[PDB]
Amino acid sequence: MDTGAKEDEDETANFSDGVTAMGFQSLDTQVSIKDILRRPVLLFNHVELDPDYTGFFIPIMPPSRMMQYKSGDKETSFQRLIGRTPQAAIMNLFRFWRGSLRYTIIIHSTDGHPIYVTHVPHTGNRVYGLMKVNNLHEYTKVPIFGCGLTTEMIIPSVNPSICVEVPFDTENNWAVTFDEDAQRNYSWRDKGDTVTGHLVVTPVVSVYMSVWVEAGDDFEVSNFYGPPSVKTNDWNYAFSDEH
Amino acid sequence: DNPHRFLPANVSNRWNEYSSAYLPRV
């Protein structure tokens, strides 16, 4: 960051700065960056799971321009409004982050069938959605949760949602937020450095699911990049205060 | 195929990003 006060060499009289209007309406101050990023953001809105696959992969990265919908391109399971959240706009200014995130899973069920969650550490790949790992046609004998990685479980009848806090498991000082191109085939060890691992979500039977995300308590952004080149058309979809 | 996979040779370096010599990219 650079204020640009460097270039403010003017030393002439000016109008008053008045008094701050902070804490006037309510004490709840929403200006802090570490408070905005700690608000939950929605990712997958009623996406389907299958017992036929290894599980549903959720790449551990903060929501930003990476997870943005552009008009008239291929359809994804990611919800379209990730691009335009306040929590995304912040992550578009910082290219480095570090610390834990907080994923919230909500299964649309009330059955005795247990659903599992598995933090796989940073292994270099950046897969999402349903995947058949190693193209096998049977995963019930050898499940991804049963291999012996850190694993919690949801039991929908008791409580059909968990809030996990995935650790910053990586060899890097910082996890990179974004790239100029997500779909570009460049050197393979650098493409991996935008995630710190994956969540996987295996069910017993087919079921739908919703996923939220936020920054944990221990979370810092850095390497400020300034604002991008943007477009808007909000004016168009509203009446003036004069008919 | 997917055009984003590889950048055209005239604008790029060996590492498959925009060359420093190529100023017009902006």
């Binding site: 204020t3 403010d8 300034g226 | -």
Partner: protein, 273 residues
């Protein structure tokens, strides 16, 4: 012994602990060996000069606009004239370009208040000489031709010459303690849908368009020497004041236009040639 436990309490069962808040308490289960361990920031930590709040971002000088000032511009002529609203840049057209950091951060919030600062950098030399008057006009606005109406407001006459930069704090003077943002709180249209009046009728909010303008008029016509350029460009920077304030997090006004590509599975999705 196996004595009976007579102590009890009435509980109200909630699914999540502090879901909507950005602070306080949480029921999160750490995916670690140690349940109470955290990420160490002993060596690698946030650098002291990084912005800690959005109000720090809103104090970064961004280049808002530019305009020209020739020798042919007779006295009283409006060089520059905009509605100074941090909410929206235009009310009557699609905007595309590079929005300033204070405007970018403002678009995240439904309400703003406090003074705004400008800085006019004249791209000139020693041999250029003129005078402009920068006026802030509230509620009622002047006519383009009547310079006298612009002079009867809050003004700062800048004598250009050796000094090529003038700072100007725009004082915050409105009927309400906070203004609400002109951009919509929620807009689900993503595919450039052709708009009608039925669409407008079912909007999220009613755009309360700002009438507060900042005009720059010629006082003394620019008289440069023969050997230099007859027309200079002026750069108009803008940041929030020292008492700038924001409230009410909403869906962002602006979004990335240039070089947006959606992520795919690497390397399942045909990365291997």
């Amino acid at each position: 012994d196996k004595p009976k436990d007579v102590s009890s309490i009435t509980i109200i069962p909630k699914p999540r602990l502090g879901f909507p808040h950005g602070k306080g308490k949480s029921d999160a289960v750490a995916m670690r060996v140690n349940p109470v361990a955290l990420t160490s920031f002993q060596d690698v930590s946030a650098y002291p000069d990084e912005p800690r709040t959005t109000l720090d971002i809103a104090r970064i000088w961004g280049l808002r606009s530019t305009f020209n000032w020739g020798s042919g511009d007779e006295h009283g002529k409006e060089l520059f004239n905009t509605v100074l609203d941090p909410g929206l840049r235009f009310y009557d057209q699609d905007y595309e370009g590079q929005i300033t950091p204070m405007e970018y951060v403002t678009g995240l919030y439904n309400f703003w208040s406090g003074p705004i600062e400008l800085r006019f950098d004249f791209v000139s030399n020693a041999f250029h000489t003129g005078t402009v008057i920068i006026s802030a006009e509230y509620n009622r606005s002047s006519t383009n031709t009547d310079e006298c109406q612009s002079h009867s407001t809050y003004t700062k006459t800048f004598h250009l010459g050796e000094q090529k930069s003038v700072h100007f704090t725009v004082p915050y003077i409105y009927d309400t303690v906070v203004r609400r943002n002109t951009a919509s709180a929620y807009l689900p249209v993503t595919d450039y849908d052709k708009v009608d009046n039925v669409s407008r009728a079912q909007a999220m909010g009613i755009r309360a368009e700002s009438k507060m303008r900042v005009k720059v008029r010629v006082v003394n016509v620019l008289r440069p020497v023969a050997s230099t350029t007859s027309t200079i460009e002026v750069l108009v920077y803008m940041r929030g004041g020292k008492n700038y304030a924001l409230h009410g997090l909403k869906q962002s006004t602006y979004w990335p236009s240039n070089s947006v590509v959606p992520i795919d599975s690497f390397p399942p999705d045909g990365y291997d040639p």
